[PDB]
Design a protein around this ligand. Structure first.
Ligand code: NI
Length: 341
């Protein structure tokens, strides 16, 4: 059944609750972002109102064929009324079009639902600064102190310099970047930019990127593989067998592949710095795992919460085991006691 952490008390609202059939008593279904665990269940046959960002709205229309009459896009950073309740959408610093939702309950309670987010100090100067938040529905994906990772900027720096050096040494080397969802576009766009190439990709993936309101996007991507030296492939094909196979398809235009796998976290983060990352190599193929996260590190999460000082925290990730739940509740208490709220 719909779990309690997907329901907004004192409203008829749900968040990211599309795979439970009709939820008894829901008058408006909110979608934080276009990732499949979140939209799971949406289709052209959905006939309830969906509230979301403009970008998520382009993807529902174009990729899932939801009918226009049911898609209700809202502008960001703007006080809006939905079924008699004031709401604001804020940027979540996750994937394109991803939002957090502020709900102002008629009784005076204020609720923030983070969706999926990477907490940042910049959020301390949004509309969130202007009033108190009583309950926080928190993205707890990496809520454990082992989860450190570098900034997005430091990771992109590493990737740009790696690719540029490799291709300047060998002008017959191909760069390939894996993907399975929206998010992490900066990786492949930053590499294509330093190399003076467009990124080439399948027709489905080009369609997906064309929904995303990226500036000058017509100049940066293409479906013509032959004219591109940065290819995107399904993440599943980013392995030695998959890459050899792909290289055969390029018709002796290339004799080397340098490939990037933007993971979330991996245990080499516990020891290794970004400067000291190395590839797995077999022959003329090298594969780099880079820790490009669109979720909060443990420290970024802790800082955001200690700044927000909520009265109650409701986790939305890792809730399925008692050991996880218990561990998270302990960090929350530590954070509250250290900060004094
Ligand atoms: Ni997500």
């Amino acid at each position: 059944t719909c779990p309690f952490y997907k329901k907004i008390p004192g409203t008829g609202f749900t968040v990211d609750a599309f795979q439970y059939g009709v939820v008894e008593g829901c008058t408006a279904y909110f979608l934080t972002h276009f990732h499949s665990d979140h939209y799971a269940g949406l289709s052209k046959h959905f006939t309830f109102p969906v509230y979301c960002s403009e970008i998520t709205g382009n993807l529902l229309k174009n990729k899932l064929h939801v009918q226009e009459q049911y898609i209700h896009p809202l502008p960001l950073d703007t006080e809006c009324i939905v079924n008699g309740v004031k709401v604001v959408l804020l940027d979540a610093n996750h994937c394109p079009g991803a939002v957090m939702i502020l709900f102002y309950l008629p009784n005076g309670t204020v609720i923030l639902h983070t969706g999926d987010f990477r907490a940042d100090p910049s959020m301390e100067r949004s509309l969130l600064a202007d009033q108190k938040v009583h309950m926080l529905y928190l993205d707890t994906t990496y809520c454990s102190p082992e989860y450190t990772f570098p900034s997005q900027q430091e990771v992109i720096r590493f990737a740009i310099n790696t690719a540029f050096e490799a291709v300047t040494l060998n002008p017959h080397a191909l760069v390939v970047c894996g993907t399975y969802s929206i998010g992490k576009e900066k990786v492949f766009l930053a590499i294509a930019d330093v190399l003076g190439s467009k990124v080439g990709m399948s027709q489905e993936k080009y369609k997906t990127l064309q929904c995303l309101n990226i500036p000058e996007i017509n100049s940066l991507i293409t479906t013509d593989m032959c004219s591109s030296l940065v290819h995107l492939l399904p993440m599943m094909q980013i392995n030695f067998k998959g890459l050899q196979s792909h290289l055969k398809k390029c018709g002796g235009k290339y004799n080397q592949i340098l490939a990037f796998r933007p993971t979330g976290w991996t245990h080499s983060n516990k020891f290794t710095r970004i400067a000291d990352v190395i590839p797995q190599t077999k022959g003329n193929i090298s594969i780099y795992g880079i820790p490009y996260s669109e979720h909060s590190s443990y420290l970024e999460m802790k800082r955001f919460v200690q700044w927000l000082k909520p009265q109650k925290i409701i986790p939305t990730v890792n809730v399925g085991t008692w050991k996880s739940r218990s561990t998270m509740e302990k960090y929350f208490r530590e954070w509250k006691l250290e900060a004094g709220y």
